[PDB]
Write a protein that binds this ligand. Structure first.
Ligand SMILES: CCO[C@@H]1C=CC=C(C(=O)[O-])[C@H]1[NH3+]
Ligand SMILES: CCO[C@@H]1C=CC=C(C(=O)[O-])[C@H]1[NH3+]
Lengths: 279, 279
């Protein structure tokens, strides 16, 4: 009774950039309570567990924070797909989750998976309706674009800043942000294809997140809806620069606001470490 | 350029109990900034790095949280000593730290180090002087014994409860506790040789700690000073039960309050995992 694991830095091509996730293989012998205890033991923002598939996919993936199981998270699933590429020749990988089966395209160089693209759940969205409270918490007077909250498992609010330097200058009051339950606050700035983001979430137990993969799809939708890109055009989103964990996420939303057909998010991943646990 | 590491559960004899620390070997090639980045990457409460000695010890140990270096911490040094026992036959280990050289006795069974005892810095102490504020934050009316704050690197406040069940019933207001800077709050209950503890510290970035090894020595002093044990008598301190990380710490203080000669803390440790990182 031992399990091998890898630590993947997701949305990075260099170790110690991007956002880490520990991926545990051959986890079918672990009861869920033990998966939870292991995720707590590692204390990474998420640990994932690779299980035999039950509905025709390649594998079933369970995602745990140190305190609870999650239905969906982008960077942990990206890292899981990249890690599993070391163990399959498949060009595509179908990972079963609580959101259904998530399709991944694996990208390789000489047998090593260096990147992947995923099709995300199509989000829903509406106005947050707490704008002055949120802006006060962030320390700014206004957003550029409408402050809207998106749902694809987790919930993501988007607040637009007028320049990248204004984004980097943010020093939010995290106590005030803690009154925004069950959501993450994503502040963004940029133009055209290239955007910068910073994510803050007391609700999700993070002062500032390096790479919020489940926010990248919704941000592409947000930018297309508010006229900064078209549906069908990709954006490059660079997150985590200010905290020294630069993370590059690519995202594209196809269709139109009223009839979205696909939400794609991709990025590189690199192995930081590999190990074995004693149970 | 790779480094091996182990995850040791300190103050435990069973994996997933006690308090984890990652121990990185052969770290002399790592600049301190990189040690800090690695400790952040792992996100364990502490990671330690094993370096060549500079003042006649066996090794020099650097202790990092995800955000800063620490001069002293008990469970990380305990785990480091136990981990290093896999690589030496020595009965005693002298580990250089910012507090000076810390002497460890290693305890083995068939070549495996299963426990260790350390001589801790002798603490200083005084009344906290914020009793009503602290008791309000904890949700209780009074302490049994004087509320005093001890210093041996970190700072530890001790608040006594009238029964173990009263200790387990505590649900502190962690926002109110956050006004207690640069210290940990240790609540305790028990009798004779056997004590229970719970530690809370927003200042040290933990809602509730499993095993606060640097608090065990000061608690023995506290109990001897306030007449519950004698100087020279050991106590058993069980921490972390309520959070499912039961941790057993043993402590003894020799001398008298005005002239302490030794503060000893010991416990078991077990390997949870072993790995290698790519830099
Ligand atoms: C600790 C915060 O972790 C985030 C929580 C929910 C969604 C994520 C993601 O989608 O990558 C995570 N990055
Ligand atoms: C995250 C909190 O970690 C504690 C910090 C300071 C001292 C410790 C110890 O002495 O074992 C640590 N347990």
């Amino acid at each position: 009774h031992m399990h091998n694991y890898v630590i993947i830095d997701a949305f990075a091509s260099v170790p110690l950039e991007g956002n880490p996730v520990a991926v545990f293989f051959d986890a079918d012998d672990l009861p869920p309570a033990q998966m939870q205890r292991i995720a707590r033991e590692m204390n990474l923002s998420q640990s994932t567990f690779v299980l035999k598939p039950r509905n025709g996919g390649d594998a079933l993936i369970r995602i745990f924070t140190p305190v609870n199981e999650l239905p969906f998270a982008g960077h942990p699933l990206l890292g899981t797909a990249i890690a599993l590429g070391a163990h399959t020749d498949n060009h595509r990988l179908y990972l079963e989750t609580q959101m259904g089966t998530i399709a991944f395209e694996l990208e390789r160089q000489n047998g090593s998976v260096i990147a992947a693209s995923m099709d995300q759940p199509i989000p829903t969205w509406t106005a947050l309706g707490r704008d002055a409270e949120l802006l006060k918490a962030l320390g700014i007077s206004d957003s550029t674009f409408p402050i809207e909250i998106y749902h694809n498992g987790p919930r993501h609010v988007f607040v637009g800043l007028p320049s990248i330097d204004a984004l980097s200058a943010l020093h939010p009051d995290h106590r005030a942000l803690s009154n925004f339950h069950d959501m993450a606050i994503n502040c963004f700035a940029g133009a055209g294809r290239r955007w910068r983001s910073r994510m803050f979430s007391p609700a999700y137990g993070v002062v500032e997140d390096a790479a919020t993969g489940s926010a990248a799809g919704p941000l592409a939708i947000h930018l297309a809806r508010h006229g900064q890109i078209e549906f069908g055009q990709p954006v490059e989103i660079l997150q985590g620069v200010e905290i020294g964990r630069p993370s590059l996420m690519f995202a594209k939303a196809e269709g139109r606001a009223e009839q979205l057909t696909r939400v794609e998010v991709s990025g590189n991943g690199v192995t930081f470490g590999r190990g074995t646990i004693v149970l």
